[PDB]
Design a protein around this ligand. Structure first.
Ligand SMILES: O=c1[nH]c(=O)n([C@H]2C[C@H](O)[C@@H](COP(=O)(O)OP(=O)(O)OP(=O)(O)O)O2)cc1F
Ligand SMILES: [Ca+2]
Length: 426
DNA sequence: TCTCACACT
DNA sequence: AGTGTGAG
């Protein structure tokens, strides 16, 4: 079993937030520019960077003042602030523009505000039968790269792409409606169409990866960016993985990937193939070891889940440094701010998508603790009312106040989080 | 520099 | 139910 059953794509909207601001403000298009939140602290934190700006070294998580040192003509759009906090509504609404188009072509799993996986297996099958048995023209794939091609016995990027595509298509056995390579190729044609539709109907450009599973689709998408798509076939996997750092594969970018590297003494994904499955399991657990054994051979079975809507709706703000909440009524006022945005977003959700959430998650962080969350508590969510929700959130966290004073809050709070969960049909 | 999904327990 | 990981 070679992990070639499915055709799966990952589509990534290139520097999406920037694109959203560039569509709305044409003065920004085709310039180095970035999206920031909170202008006051060091010019604001950069959450999205156009490709022109990235060429100067500007990255996400940079302060805008720092990015301006690297890129003096950098243009900035600020995120909308509402009730003292960054509000992402405009981007969420652009994201829904895009997913609704993608869903006309295939079933899509929303992976984040700017990317979606796409299961094209069924769509490919139908296109294959309408195609009589007729060859696939290079003209159907005007922005597609075939990973690992050209090879064997031109100095410009587009010349390379074409030569690789020619070599791919010249050897395609179109007379076999079950070759996985043919299916990928038809998958790629559909994604060219889907990306043409997204750009025509929204003005947004994006990159896509096309392969046999989600991890490879995602890896492929990042290989030829921006506004390009890449086909990673099963056959390309041994050479692709032979120099591919372990941390580049989805879910190995963190502690597990680090311990795979250290315990095993390897650097690249393909070095995993010399270990038995039992060996991998003993070091990393039954699930992880099984997952690694198959993955380093290009095989992964995680399904594209037919889910175009988030499972949770969440509202958080950080209060770092001297800005940590120290008084009771301060903590109340911000919970109320969080509860109010949440109500706004919950009501739109109940009306657009026919469902109500039923559980409220409250999470806080205390100054001096180490981790994203210090403590997580839940309670019932019965009415979309901001005042009750914030009253309830306070109720389930007021005992964390180690201060004996009634009006003070120690240790001061460095993060407040309200999340609606456990949706049911409405 | 605010999100969202999921595995373990 | 609560914590921790991984990612955008
Ligand atoms: O830390 C983050 N903060 C943060 O707001 N977002 C938001 C803002 C951003 O446009 C969007 C994109 O996430 P991506 O990691 O996929 O990167 P892009 O900007 O779209 O460009 P590309 O995929 O490299 O071409 O999510 C992602 C984060 F990772
Ligand atoms: Ca993106």
């Amino acid at each position: 079993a070679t992990g070639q059953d499915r055709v799966v794509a990952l589509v990534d909207m290139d520097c999406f937030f920037v694109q959203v601001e560039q569509r709305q403000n044409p003065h920004l298009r085709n310039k180095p520019c970035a999206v920031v939140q909170y202008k006051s602290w060091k010019g604001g934190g950069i959450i999205a960077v156009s490709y022109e700006a990235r060429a100067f070294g500007v990255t996400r998580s940079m302060w805008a003042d720092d990015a301006k040192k690297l890129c003096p003509d950098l243009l900035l759009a600020q995120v909308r602030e509402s009730r003292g906090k960054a509000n992402l509504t405009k981007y969420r609404e652009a994201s829904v523009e895009v997913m609704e188009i993608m869903s006309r072509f295939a079933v899509i799993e929303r992976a984040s505000i700017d990317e979606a996986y796409v299961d094209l297996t069924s769509a490919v099958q139908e296109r294959l039968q309408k195609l009589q048995g007729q060859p696939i023209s290079a003209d159907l794939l005007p922005s597609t790269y075939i990973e690992g091609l050209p090879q064997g016995p031109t100095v410009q990027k587009e010349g390379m792409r074409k030569q690789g595509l020619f070599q791919w298509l010249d050897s395609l056995q179109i007379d076999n409606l079950t070759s996985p390579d043919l299916q990928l190729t038809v998958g790629a044609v559909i994604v060219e169409e889907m990306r043409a539709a997204i750009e025509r109907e929204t003005g947004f450009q994006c990159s896509a990866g096309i392969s046999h599973n989600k991890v490879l689709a995602k890896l492929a998408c990042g290989l030829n960016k921006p506004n390009r798509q890449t086909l990673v076939s099963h056959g390309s996997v041994p050479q692709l993985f032979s120099q591919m750092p372990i941390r580049k594969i989805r879910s190995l970018g963190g502690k597990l990937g680090a311990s795979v590297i250290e315990i095993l003494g390897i650097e690249y994904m393909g070095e995993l193939t010399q270990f038995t499955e039992s060996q991998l399991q003993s070091h990393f657990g039954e699930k992880n070891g099984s997952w690694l054994y198959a993955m380093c051979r290009g095989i992964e079975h995680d399904p594209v889940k037919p889910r175009q809507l988030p499972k949770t709706i969440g509202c958080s703000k950080n209060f770092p440094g001297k800005t940590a909440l120290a008084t009771r009524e301060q903590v109340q006022w911000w919970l109320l701010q969080l509860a109010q945005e949440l109500e706004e977003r919950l009501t739109k959700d109940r009306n657009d998508n026919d469902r109500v959430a039923t559980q409220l998650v409250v999470s806080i962080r205390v100054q001096g603790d180490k981790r994203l969350s210090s403590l997580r508590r839940c309670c019932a969510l019965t009415r979309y009312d901001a005042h009750k929700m914030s009253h309830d959130a306070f109720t389930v966290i007021k005992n964390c106040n180690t201060s004996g004073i009634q009006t003070e809050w120690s240790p001061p709070l460095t993060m407040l989080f309200l999340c609606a969960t456990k949706f049911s049909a409405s």
